[PDB]
Amino acid sequence: MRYRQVHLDFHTSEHISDIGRNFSKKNFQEMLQLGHVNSITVFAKCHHGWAYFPSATNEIHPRLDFDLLGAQIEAAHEIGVKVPIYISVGFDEKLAWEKPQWLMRDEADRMNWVDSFMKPGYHQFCLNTPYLDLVIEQVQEVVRKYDGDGIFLDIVGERTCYCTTCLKQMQADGLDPHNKEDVIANGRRIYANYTTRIREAIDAIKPGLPVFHNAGHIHQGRRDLMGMNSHLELESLPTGGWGYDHFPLSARYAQPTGFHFLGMTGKFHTFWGEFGGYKHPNALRYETALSLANGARCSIGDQLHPGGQMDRATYELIGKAYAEVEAKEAWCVNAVNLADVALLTVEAAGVQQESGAMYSGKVDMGAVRMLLEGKILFDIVDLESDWSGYKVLILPDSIVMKDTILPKVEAFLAAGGKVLASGRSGLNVELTRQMLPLGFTDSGLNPFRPDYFRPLCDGMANLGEAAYVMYGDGRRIELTDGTELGRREDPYFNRQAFRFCSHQHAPSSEQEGGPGMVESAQGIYIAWNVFEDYATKGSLILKEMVLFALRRLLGEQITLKTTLPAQGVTTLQHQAAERRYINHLLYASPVKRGERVEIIEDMIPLQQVEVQLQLPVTDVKRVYLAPQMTEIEFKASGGDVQFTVPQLECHQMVVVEYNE
Amino acid sequence: MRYRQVHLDFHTSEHISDIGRNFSKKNFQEMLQLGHVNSITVFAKCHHGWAYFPSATNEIHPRLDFDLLGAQIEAAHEIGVKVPIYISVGFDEKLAWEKPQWLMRDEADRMNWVDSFMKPGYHQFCLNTPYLDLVIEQVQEVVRKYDGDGIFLDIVGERTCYCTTCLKQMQADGLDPHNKEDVIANGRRIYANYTTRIREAIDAIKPGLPVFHNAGHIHQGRRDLMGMNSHLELESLPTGGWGYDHFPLSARYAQPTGFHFLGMTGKFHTFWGEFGGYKHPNALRYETALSLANGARCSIGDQLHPGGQMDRATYELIGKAYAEVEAKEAWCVNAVNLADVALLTVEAAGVQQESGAMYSGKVDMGAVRMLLEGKILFDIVDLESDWSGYKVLILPDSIVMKDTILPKVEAFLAAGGKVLASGRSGLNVELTRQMLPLGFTDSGLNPFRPDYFRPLCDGMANLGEAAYVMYGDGRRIELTDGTELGRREDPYFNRQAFRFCSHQHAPSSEQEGGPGMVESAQGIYIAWNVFEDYATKGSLILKEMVLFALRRLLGEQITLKTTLPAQGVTTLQHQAAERRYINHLLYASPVKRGERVEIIEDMIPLQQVEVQLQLPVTDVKRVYLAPQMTEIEFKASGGDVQFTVPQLECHQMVVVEYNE
């Protein structure tokens, strides 16, 4: 899987003329070279529904006079650039106008994404209709006729559809359209039927041609949906609707599954379709680095001007990131993540949470923020993952012990694992009893919110002893055999009519309300929804409480310590074949501009970044900066090594060579 | 005016007992010393309406047994700490329950801030009622009986009120309550009558006792409202509702007026009343530094626990900022700002704008962001300011040439000033004709939005030649005697039903649409609302266009150039008495946590920050880091000096000593 990809959008209105008139093999090749691009996904069929080749199963764009798809594959292949081919599935707008009977409908007869033809935008087809047969024919034609390096199928996933075809079919199969569960399950079958028919059609022509089905998100805990692809493309524009948490939450779930996967961002300031929109180079330098460090290849979105001329400014911008990716690839191929901590996301565990961004939940964003800022080495796991390689399992806020979860947690604890649990985590489904041996009994929903946490151990809060406000829902708890690491204090009263103090919550009554943080032999419990609190209010104390509990659980076994500050990111990747570890160190700080877009313009050097590793190896040979190939001083005793990076700009890889 | 103030909130419910029971002279003094506090505003009367002294004109808090106000003034005065005294005016909640007839009403009979007594919160009194007489009595009592260092009067400003008293009075004075203008003007008289009665009552007891009337914002272009105070306190919690633009927009307007003024932030993570809420020290280190650099003293908000014990964690946190302010004060007293650029805010010019934060407009935030990120030395000016000392006047987006503005702009241009204007700036009120000699004629509202700007000069856009998307409303214009610095390109069409291309706007038609940026002898015009665009979308090209035009207008006369990166702030302040300039250099990067709060945890050193100054002095004696008192190498030729700061952490002052 190539590291330096471009996703070249070509959603082009029938009402624009002279399509491709300014295309040239020379221009296409010069700009790929300016961008250091080694793969470019080009269009066979766009959202408007047109083919960019003289098609027999679809209509060519009515203002295109030549085989643009063919010319692009030839131009790229002649300079060693691979060319996966894009087909819009969910959208075919020129067919939408002829076959509205095949479009998705909600319960109230509404189309998506746009609810009429009297407004601009696209109308999604239902794959439970004969539109599926037309899609297979069109996919078959492209796979037969063109020497592409794979197929990208867009606007697909499990839907809920109430179109005439779906309502008749559900009634004939004895399903109830008024039962939401029935319609969700119908849509699971409809989607699986589509991906099964695509794999069979393609395997009858070019066996093992790569296929990716784009839903815009990799749904966690769904191995069936991931397995319908040959590889994963994580569409994740941090300035385009996804936010900056979405990529690490996805990548740290993807890498341990064994799938090859890329992070796809955009060249655009905002989102897809932003003609004339440009990030600063430093944004793409950091975003590509963060893909490499997490075990991913890179894609950068672009849209080709209707005239077919590739934009110089764009490939200048892509090249500033991709020249650096070229020099580092060698240290990223076949890499496996070393992690101390398994995070079972609320999403992976199949439990309801508050949305905090388009495809991320608030508990999950809370936890990932603390893990990244805390330099904890982690993977994200689901109920199918093997937990036994992880020292600590995090159960954030809402992991109730249902039939599908408790046995796997009990087995992890029996085998010597430790758990960090917060809030409802560990409760039975009924929320009446704590089922994990964490050293306390549950006395029910805490009856004050907000309330206070007082640390009872030194080195937890940077400012020391105080009553710190907790905004999360709490559990009142009673110590049994556990050790108290901090306590709950009640406010004088809850903010209410006739009883309120100042602008917000009442101050602390300074009356003890039982323990707030409890340590036992098998881990640490925090009596508040602290992870959702950190994604909502962002109080620093929430992170300090969690990172204190994790550092205590990991003790002397912690694999990494560093002075890399909070906004920085680190990973420790293993190239076994090459008998080396790669410590990835990054520092960039997105900053809010416009109303809410978080952007990167500055890239500030750090100096004298100290790392202490604890590798499961016998003898450390040497330590060097890649790709500079600059030895640095280190001190090693067995697999325990310490070093200092003189200077870090954006991203620095530090290679530790060993003897096993 | 002291540099190290605390605003000690004490809004305390009647339903909390043992008020002040844990107060002690020793605790109050220890915590002031831990915090390096040299002034603390303490409460005589809170929002709940209680006195904190045995009052004859108001009721003491019913659970307070001793003169808390008296004890606090004595404890502070005995260690050389000044004590201004706080009186809630707008709120007296225990009186609200007895005299609801004196409360403000809107057109629909609604109270503010909270629209019933069956919900928690405060109910604002109307100062057009006999409540004003009770306020004067209570202010008189506090000024007679207590040795305070000033009065802070809270919840006041110009209102619009439709209470029974106001409606009767308006009808009797021949005003029309259904005419909004009439009610606004009534409220201007009501507020002026309140501040006039306060100054006369206080001057009859302690002539020239400091008074500040808090509206939460200094309204720009209103010298009458500023002049009702002895000094200005800019309430500006960047994590508490105000945002990070509000302080520089206010401070760079305040300093050149001659008022002594402070920046008031909070110790809290969020806003006032956040018991148990704590920022990281680095946030207050930066925020206090930014006050010093802009010519302001510092206040940090706190709220005293009802028990009267000052919180150790809080005064640890305040001390980490205030120890550093103590060492730097010497270089901030009697300082005057050196600026190349006058920014006439939309607010100062009295013109409508889109709100972009609680008390800042989008055009004004756009402009301040570009000036700070661009290291342009600036003041904010109104129609009463003297413009003649400024090389460049900025007219952002919407400064139409009404009777109150055009003569002052024509006089500034005649005297050799240059203007940067955008969008509607310079148009007549009718928006049919450009009234400034900027080298083009106006051909009306541009009929495409969005559209494109192509730079025609090198060194404008970091990625070079391209069509960059402009989202702001445009003016189509026609070159006459001006020079074109870039052009407008039309899209194929506007996004509409039946005509749309891809997800957003149509790509560039590459058809010239007239000039977009025009240079003349007297300045530069940009044919888009670029400042509102930068506060909405945040496209980097918008800043690059503006800073290119400003650098061109200033040419060789630019007073400062630096490698301090974009997120950094610089000012050049003049201590005339001490025959030195102070170059202030800051780097901190607030980062979004929770849902939207922008916080500071990291403080990253910068290295080898280069500055070139052009001072109007003959001979530079020396250059040193204060307060370290460390000489640095420099090269001077007349008033032209260059130096390099080895290391900058948070804030560094660089002192340039001269001979005139």
Ligand SMILES: [Zn+2]
């Ligand atoms: Zn359907």
Ligand SMILES: [Zn+2]
């Ligand atoms: Zn009134």
